[PDB]
């Protein structure tokens, strides 16, 4: 409202300021059908995103708000949407009002409208599976994200707690130092889907740090879907919530047979 419904959304990137559609050259000739480079050895082919979402800044009213759009702007999350207030999709962090609109639709596709798949991608990247309502993100690749700062084991967790808190309600944040990775669990799946594309290929530099001019040279942090949590301290919490989900559904389900009779 005061942060979001008050203003209109602003143009994040000018359309001339958009990146070139051809990728960085990793080959000898450019392939026209598959927009890639062909006679090349290899490449890491991952780079730091030049753009980022300032959530309290860039959010605002858009065209899809008046049109009743259900889906969020994918580029708004990448910090790249050049249409601004003229864009068909939404430009704000998902709320309980928004996800209630998505409740019939979230089952088969994400908050960005992209259709989910049968099983996960092999590396647990990408869009996701409709067979599992996964709400936990695997924050990886932090070493290239920090541009090889040591910093602390636990000041790493502070930056992760700071950034992902802007992107929605959080169930928990767990950082593992020996594996050098984080596990962020959200209240809703829709925020996790939103924060995943928001935080892919980002950096955690915090401008005040000395490497802020070389935020671009680094790698960027992988945000991937997370696996199941292997300790039985968490396993028993899963069947506890699955119990409570079942009890909340049976009450809803006997009322259907009440109306059926």
């Amino acid at each position: 409202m005061t942060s979001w419904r008050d203003k209109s959304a602003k143009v994040q990137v000018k359309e001339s300021e958009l990146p070139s559609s051809i990728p960085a050259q990793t080959g000898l000739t450019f392939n026209i059908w598959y927009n890639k480079w062909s006679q090349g050895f290899a490449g890491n082919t991952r780079f730091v995103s030049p753009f980022a979402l300032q959530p309290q800044l860039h959010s605002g009213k858009t065209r899809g708000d008046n049109d009743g759009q259900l889906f969020f702007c994918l580029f708004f999350a990448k910090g790249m949407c050049c249409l601004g207030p003229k864009c068909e999709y939404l430009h704000h962090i998902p709320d309980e009002e928004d996800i209630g609109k998505l409740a019939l639709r979230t089952e088969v596709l994400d908050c960005f409208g992209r259709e989910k798949f049968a099983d996960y991608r092999e590396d647990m990247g990408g869009i996701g599976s409709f067979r599992k309502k996964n709400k936990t993100l695997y924050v990886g690749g932090i070493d290239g994200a920090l541009n090889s700062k040591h910093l602390k084991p636990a000041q790493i967790e502070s930056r992760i707690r700071f950034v992902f808190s802007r992107l929605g309600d959080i169930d928990r944040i767990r950082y593992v130092e020996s594996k050098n990775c984080g596990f962020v669990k959200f209240k809703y799946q829709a925020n996790a889907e939103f924060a995943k594309e928001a935080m892919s290929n980002q950096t955690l530099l915090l401008p005040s740090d000395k490497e802020w001019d070389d935020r671009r040279e680094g790698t960027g942090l992988l945000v991937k879907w997370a696996n199941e949590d292997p300790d039985p301290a968490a396993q028993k919490r899963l069947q506890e919530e699955l119990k409570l989900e079942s009890l909340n559904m049976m009450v809803h389900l006997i009322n259907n047979n009440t109306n059926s009779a």
Partner: protein, 193 residues
Amino acid sequence: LLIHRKGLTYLHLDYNFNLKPTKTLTTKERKKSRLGNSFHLMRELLKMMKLIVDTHVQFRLGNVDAFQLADGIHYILNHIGQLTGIYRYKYKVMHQIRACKDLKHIIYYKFNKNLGKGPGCGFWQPAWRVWLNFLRGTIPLLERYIGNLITRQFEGRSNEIVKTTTKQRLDAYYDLELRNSVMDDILEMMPES
């Protein structure tokens, strides 16, 4: 787009529709980069077409006079066998090439009465009709020829390829039927087990 969808980015197709490899090719690349008659025949039609259209561009730009233009088109339509090399892929076109040569002999000696041997003769109409009738014959052909090619790109080869009997595999197929017939008759004789 067709070349690059097949992954053949090392073949360069220039603007005059000549197809040349950009590097020395390994044998696995030479097998993959073999393009059929339907691809090249389609290319040679465009190479014939662009060669005509470029002369009308040359006339319109002002480099070429209208008498040079009409002679230029008449030089094209008579020498397509020499200019383009379409024959290699559809050798029936030698009927149209030897027809355009024969019309060239008829036209010149009625044209060059009381004139010397010289380049300029622009009566391209007789030779024009021969190509248009050749185009008429190959429109149903290439639409079948490329229509199989493009669906092979999008859908792939059918897994149900059944080889007809041919002169090369007749002696093998004669043996397969012979072993089956002997197998069936002996197995009926057998009481059990």
